[PDB]
């Protein structure tokens, strides 16, 4: 059956931009530690230059209805259009939020999109909406669907801004179509999956593959 | 293939392109135009059926 | 069309405020509609230009 | 006409602004609406006009 | 089925609205009852 | 005429399963189920139809 997105799954938020008469795919990314601001990591040239995908992965922590979220703030589900989702950054464990600052010069009504340490408030909650009439509110979000993300706290879209020379991501009143491509759903216990950090041991001899120590003559 | 039920993608045989809609040109929605030029594209969109 | 825009804004003002107080139910709806159609703010309050 | 349109728009937004008692009670919706209005209209522009 | 889904979503919204409150007042009870009567009829229609 | 000619009665269709599309049929191509059909421009248009 057509695959659906569920909470605790891992996704990358992906958009596409036409640059020099060529379609280019980009993923939302953020370091978290040292820089809370989100940026766009291209992924169309993966054959020649691998993308830094470790920091583009988000986990769907929760997905409530709007009224349920209101009650929660006052005090493996399947995502449905019109629900509000919480996205946790896999690396830093911060949450994708609409910031109250703005460094943009092209747009005077845009806010910065970045990571936020805690999941308190409404800044970290986003509502999904169908991009086309093919889907409608209450329908299940289907893998590979283009959807529009709206901030719960600011009523702004997750927007790709090309006004300046470079591609940037902000929260504005213009809309952009994003894809929540799944990275992983659920792993059988004890089995290796891609995108994992691990050690490569020589058989069972307590010897691992490595590079030279920092400040070595071989340049590591 | 069934009427109404089946959802079909149209493909140009020789080139392999897919029948889709051109990216809605600007200022046309502003005037009020609600027709989208159809094009043949290499990938298309998910709602091309 | 500033002249027509002024007339429409004026009807909205009567709906949003009654007897010297704001009707929250209508005010929130009006604000959300206006932000969903940014052209209602006039060319000055446009984001880009 | 342009000045009147913008005056009417600012008047409508000010009238859509929430009430002080709701703000004191700290209603989430009221706070969100006030934040949206504050983001739409800067204070320096109001003082300049 | 589609109408039933819309009605179910509306009833879930009503429950979430009242979940924090301790007692549902008379008007809320009346609206719940009307929605439940409609849902009963819809279930009977599907059963038939 | 009184001279004879040999003809072939090649079959086009015999019997169609109910609700299924067959070749040689006139139909509309709707965009999914969105009440939008594939068409050309109206008569007397600048694009030459």
DSSP assignment of A129-184 equals EESSTTS-TTSBPBTT-EEEEEETTT--EEEEE-SSSS-EEEEESS---EEEEEEE
Q: How distant is the alpha carbon of residue A204 from its chain centre?
A: 38
For residue A17, which of A43, A36, A38, A37 has the smallest C-alpha distance? Answer: A43
Structure tokens at A213: 């120590």
E25 is in an annotated binding site: no
Could you tell me the maximum CA-CA distance found in chain E, to the nearest angstrom?
A: 38
Helix (H) or strand (E) holding A18: strand A10-18
Q: How was this structure determined?
A: cryo-EM
Determine the Cα–Cα distance for residues A14 and F11; give it in Å rounded to an integer.
53
Size of interface A-E (CB pairs under 8 A): 18
User: Resolution in A for the shown PDB structure?
Assistant: 2.6
Structure tokens at A80: 């449905």
Judging contacts by C-beta atoms under 8 Å, the chain B residues touching residue A23 are 43
Determine the Cα–Cα distance for residues C34 and C42; give it in Å rounded to an integer.
11
Query: CB–CB of B9/B18 below 8 Å?
Result: yes
Determine the Cα–Cα distance for residues D15 and C19; give it in Å rounded to an integer.
12
Does A touch F (3+ CB pairs < 8 Å)?
yes
Determine the Cα–Cα distance for residues B22 and B39; give it in Å rounded to an integer.
6
Determine the Cα–Cα distance for residues A52 and A59; give it in Å rounded to an integer.
17
Strands A168-172 and A157-161 come out as antiparallel
Judging contacts by C-beta atoms under 8 Å, the chain A residues touching residue D36 are 154-155
Helix (H) or strand (E) holding A25: strand A23-29
Question: C22 forms bridges with which residues in the sheet?
Answer: C17
Sorted by sequence, the CB contacts under 8 Å of residue C34 that are 6+ apart come out as C40, C41
Q: Is F19 in contact with B7 (Cβ distance < 8 A)?
A: no
Question: A17 forms bridges with which residues in the sheet?
Answer: A24
CB atoms within 10 A of CB D8: 19
Please tell me which of the candidates D2, D6, D12 has its beta carbon nearest to residue C12.
Answer: D12
Please tell me which residue of chain A has the smallest CA distance to F36. A133
The full DSSP string for F1-49 is --S--------S-S---TTB--TT-----BSTTSS-B---PPSS-TT--
């Amino acid at each position: 059956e057509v695959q659906f997105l569920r909470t605790d799954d891992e996704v990358v938020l992906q958009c596409s931009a036409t640059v020099l008469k060529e379609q280019l795919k980009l993923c939302l990314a953020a370091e978290g530690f040292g820089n809370r601001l989100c940026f766009l990591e291209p992924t169309s040239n993966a054959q020649n230059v691998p993308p830094d995908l470790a920091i583009c992965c988000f986990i769907l922590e929760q997905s409530l209805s709007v009224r349920a979220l209101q009650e929660m703030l006052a005090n493996h589900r399947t995502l449905l259009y019109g629900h509000a989702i919480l996205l946790r950054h896999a690396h830093s464990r911060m949450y994708l939020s609409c910031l109250t600052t703005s460094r943009s010069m092209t747009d005077k009504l845009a806010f910065d999109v970045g990571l936020q340490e805690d999941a308190t408030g409404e800044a970290c909650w986003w509502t999904m909406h169908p991009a086309s009439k093919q889907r409608s509110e209450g329908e299940k979000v289907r893998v590979g669907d283009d959807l529009i993300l709206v901030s719960v706290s600011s009523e702004r879209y997750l927007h790709l801004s090309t006004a300046s020379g470079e591609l940037q991501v902000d929260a504005s009143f213009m809309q952009t179509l994003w894809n929540m491509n799944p990275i992983c759903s659920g792993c059988e216990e004890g089995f290796v999956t891609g995108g994992h950090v691990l050690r490569l041991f020589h058989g069972h001899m307590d010897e691992c593959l490595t590079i030279s120590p920092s400040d070595s003559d071989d340049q590591r | 293939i069934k009427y109404g039920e089946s959802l079909c993608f149209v493909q140009h045989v020789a080139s392999g392109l897919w029948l889709t809609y051109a990216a809605p040109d600007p200022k046309a929605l502003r005037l009020g135009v609600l027709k989208k030029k159809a094009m043949l594209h290499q990938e298309g969109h998910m709602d091309d059926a | 069309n500033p002249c027509g825009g002024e007339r429409y804004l004026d009807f909205l003002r009567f709906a949003v405020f009654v007897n010297g107080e704001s009707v929250e139910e209508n005010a929130n709806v009006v604000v959300r509609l206006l932000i969903r159609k940014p052209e209602c703010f006039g060319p000055a309050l446009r984001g880009e230009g | 006409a342009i000045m009147s349109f913008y005056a009417a728009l600012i008047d409508l937004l000010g009238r859509c602004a929430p009430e002080t008692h709701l703000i004191q009670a700290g209603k989430g919706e009221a706070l969100r609406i006030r934040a949206i209005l504050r983001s739409l209209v800067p204070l320096d522009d109001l003082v300049g006009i | 089925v589609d109408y039933l889904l819309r009605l179910q979503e509306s009833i879930s919204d009503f429950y979430w609205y009242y979940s924090g409150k301790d007692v549902i007042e008379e008007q809320g009870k009346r609206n719940f009852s009307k929605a439940m009567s409609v849902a009963k009829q819809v279930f009977n229609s599907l059963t038939e």
